[PDB]
């Protein structure tokens, strides 16, 4: 029963080479299928990179062909990807795939995917900035959690005896550093009399920041 699994480093430094492996189980690599690689950037679409078959024939995305090497070793049930001269634009989920040869060109199955992050960053705690209204029945405050590395952070809120609704937004990778935000909504006319604080924990830097949201 055919299964694919990608492995390799999740972090790659710009200018260096990205090297990934894919292990095939339950199916012979000596059959008439290609084995290849697809990638997908967060919130974007799917991009075919290339493929290889046991005879040695390879196909590459022409725009990446000079940087891409895809190979296979059936003695290790392996397909490999090597992408040289990595940039920040190469951050993506990378998928290995079995591809039917010939005019069919269909992709099945796909591996679960491996997250590749291209960044030169050191371990960096977040800078946490308060989000207070500019000068209805509720008010919304927040915390901007900027310029941290690596993932992840956790944001918790303390709004005392106020009923609250928390929205914690996913992170964006911008120039090798993450930014996220979190908001808390409390009843209008409660805050600022009643205190509201975000606690942002970044275990990688052993740092937690407790930011009280002050009125402007």
């Amino acid at each position: 029963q055919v299964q694919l699994e990608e492995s390799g480093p999740g972090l790659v430094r710009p200018s260096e080479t990205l090297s990934l492996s894919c292990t095939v189980s339950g199916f012979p690599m000596s059959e008439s299928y290609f084995w290849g690689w697809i990638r997908q950037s967060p919130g974007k679409g799917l991009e075919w990179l290339g493929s290889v078959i046991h005879t040695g024939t390879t196909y590459y995305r022409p725009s990446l062909e000079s940087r891409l090497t895809i190979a296979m070793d059936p003695s290790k049930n392996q397909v490999s990807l090597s992408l040289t001269s990595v940039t920040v634009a190469d951050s993506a989920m990378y998928y290995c795939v079995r591809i039917r040869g010939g005019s069919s060109n269909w992709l099945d199955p796909w591996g679960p995917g491996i997250v590749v992050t291209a960044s030169s960053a050191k371990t960096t705690p977040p800078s946490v900035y308060p989000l207070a209204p500019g000068c209805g029945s509720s008010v919304t405050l927040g915390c901007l959690v900027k310029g941290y590395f690596p993932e992840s952070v956790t944001v918790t809120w303390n709004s005392g005896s106020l009923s609250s609704s928390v929205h914690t937004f996913p992170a964006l990778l911008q120039s090798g550093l993450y930014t996220m935000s979190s908001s808390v909504t409390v009843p209008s006319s409660t805050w600022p009399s009643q205190t509201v604080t975000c606690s942002v924990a970044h275990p990688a830097s052993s740092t937690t920041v407790d930011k009280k949201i002050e009125p402007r």
Binding site: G43, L46, W110, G142, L144, P170, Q174
Partner: protein
Amino acid sequence: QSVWTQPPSVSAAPGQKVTISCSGDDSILRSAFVSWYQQVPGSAPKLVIFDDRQRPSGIPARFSGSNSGTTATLDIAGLQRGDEADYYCAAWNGRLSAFVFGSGTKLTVLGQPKSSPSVTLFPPSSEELETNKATLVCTITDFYPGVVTVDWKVDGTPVTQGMETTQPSKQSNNKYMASSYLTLTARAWERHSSYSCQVTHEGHTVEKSLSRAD
């Protein structure tokens, strides 16, 4: 083209049907077999149609494919909650020598009433401004279906640079949330007056604005 054109999203109630188009230049798709893939954003794509109109083992006849030579179409009848996914077409483009995907279509199988987005716009903090940078944050919550487009204006004029928006993510009540960021230098913040975040959802806009001088 190096990407096939698909509509960004479609929606319908359980039991209804949708149609998803996939088009290339002139009649380029007559020359290639089109395949379709279903992806839950949390997971890998899965093959649902191959060779224009064939179904792999386990895919019900509710899914059907067609290819006009110019446009390929995925039809999904008898909609069920589990059909909710992003759908991509794909095919070899012989003019480019590459395997090309469509731009993707989000399908929502409507499980609750439409909910318009709640938008809040925040100015940069004085603390951030001390670092010579300014970020405006536009939070967007409680929208359903989970598809929005965000536009920013500064001094009444569209912003084309320094904006980025998260992909929508699900709330505990199955509506969606997202955040958009406008990044500027501190000097640019000080040299403009009005700032606006415009969220389009189901063909209608919700806008918040502020003036630095407040």
